[PDB]
Amino acid sequence: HCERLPYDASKWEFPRDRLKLGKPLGRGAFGQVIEADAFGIDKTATCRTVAVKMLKEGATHSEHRALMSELKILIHIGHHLNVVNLLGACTKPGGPLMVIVEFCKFGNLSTYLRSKRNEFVPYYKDFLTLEHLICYSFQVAKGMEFLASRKCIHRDLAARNILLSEKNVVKICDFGLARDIYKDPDYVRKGDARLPLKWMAPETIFDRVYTIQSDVWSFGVLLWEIFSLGASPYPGVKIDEEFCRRLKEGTRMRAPDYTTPEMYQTMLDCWHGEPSQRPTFSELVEHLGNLLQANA
Numbered sequence: 001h002c003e004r005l006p007y008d009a010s011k012w013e014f015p016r017d018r019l020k021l022g023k024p025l026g027r028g029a030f031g032q033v034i035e036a037d038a039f040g041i042d043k044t045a046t047c048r049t050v051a052v053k054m055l056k057e058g059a060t061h062s063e064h065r066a067l068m069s070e071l072k073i074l075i076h077i078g079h080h081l082n083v084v085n086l087l088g089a090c091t092k093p094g095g096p097l098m099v100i101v102e103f104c105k106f107g108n109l110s111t112y113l114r115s116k117r118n119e120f121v122p123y124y125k126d127f128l129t130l131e132h133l134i135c136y137s138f139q140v141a142k143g144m145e146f147l148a149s150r151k152c153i154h155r156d157l158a159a160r161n162i163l164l165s166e167k168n169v170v171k172i173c174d175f176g177l178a179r180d181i182y183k184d185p186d187y188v189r190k191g192d193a194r195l196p197l198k199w200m201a202p203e204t205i206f207d208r209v210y211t212i213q214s215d216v217w218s219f220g221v222l223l224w225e226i227f228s229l230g231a232s233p234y235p236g237v238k239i240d241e242e243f244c245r246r247l248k249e250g251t252r253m254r255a256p257d258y259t260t261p262e263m264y265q266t267m268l269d270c271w272h273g274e275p276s277q278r279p280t281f282s283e284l285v286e287h288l289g290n291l292l293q294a295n296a
């Protein structure tokens with residue numbers, strides 16, 4: 001019910017003429033993310049590279065409404081290190097709606113991890129390590145615990161929706177309309193929609209129920225993505241009626257190549273058939289904190 005949420009223009013509004021738009025970072029059918037240089041958006045008179053989400057040719061007012069609600073919910077949620085951080089917006093009549101967020105150096109985590117297979121050691125500068133992987137996992141859990149505290153749920157948690165910034169900081173985001181879900185293999189046709197079936201809890205697939213505990217299921221799939229270094233979930237499996245049936249039966253993914261035993265058990269915990277029996281994000285924060293310390 002985001003339509004009732006406030007937009008404080010005096011706080012958030014940024015002039016369009018102080019935003020210099022550049023190269024596209026991601027494009028969907030109706031939306032896009034573009035790199036930009038913003039003059040004095042978060043620090044007085046200093047240029048800052050940012051990312052801005054806006055609509056594309058083909059978009060209608062319905063997509064405009066959706067982007068406005070997205071802005072409003074980001075304001076409601078507020079700032080956390082592990083959520084993509086809202087810097088401002090351009091909402092004034094006479095131009096397109098633009099939502100401005102912090103630029104994350106390395107882009108989406110799925111593509112990044114997939115690029116580091118030859119630059120990984122469990123325990124070499126700029127090499128990824130097991131510590132990095134557990135650290136990213138811990139950070140996403142922290143971000144999701146925060147989102148839950150704001151009475152919000154994600155509904156599309158996956159490595160493609162995690163951003164990697166400098167100093168190994170990861171941030172939860174949602175590309176949304178800026179992703180081409182009709183062309184993206186991660187989204188499968190189900191009824192009158194294209195859905196991320198491989199990341200979805202059984203109750204979401206079968207009953208269309210979305211809760212923080214279905215986000216926990218998705219977090220388990222995310223963990224699998226991290227510890228496979230960006231592999232595609234359910235390798236060599238056709239995503240059809242039989243897949244969904246077997247999933248409800250209790251079929252689960254095998255351990256990914258770079259996992260630890262306790263990380264794999266954590267995945268299995270997140271994939272409990274009963275939503276209430278899955279760990280909470282607060283439990284996951286505690287556990288992954290312990291695992292990160294045990295690693296060091």
Ligand SMILES: CNC(=O)c1c(C)oc2cc(Oc3ccnc4cc(OCCN5CCOCC5)ccc34)ccc12
Nearest residue numbers: 025033051053099101102103104105106107173174175
């Ligand atoms: C709920 N709202 C949102 O999630 C988002 C809003 C309002 O704007 C966004 C913009 C997003 O895209 C990016 C944000 C911040 N930084 C990004 C950096 C990107 O790529 C960096 C450059 N890459 C590095 C890797 O090699 C290729 C080039 C791509 C996309 C980026 C993601 C998510 C959002």
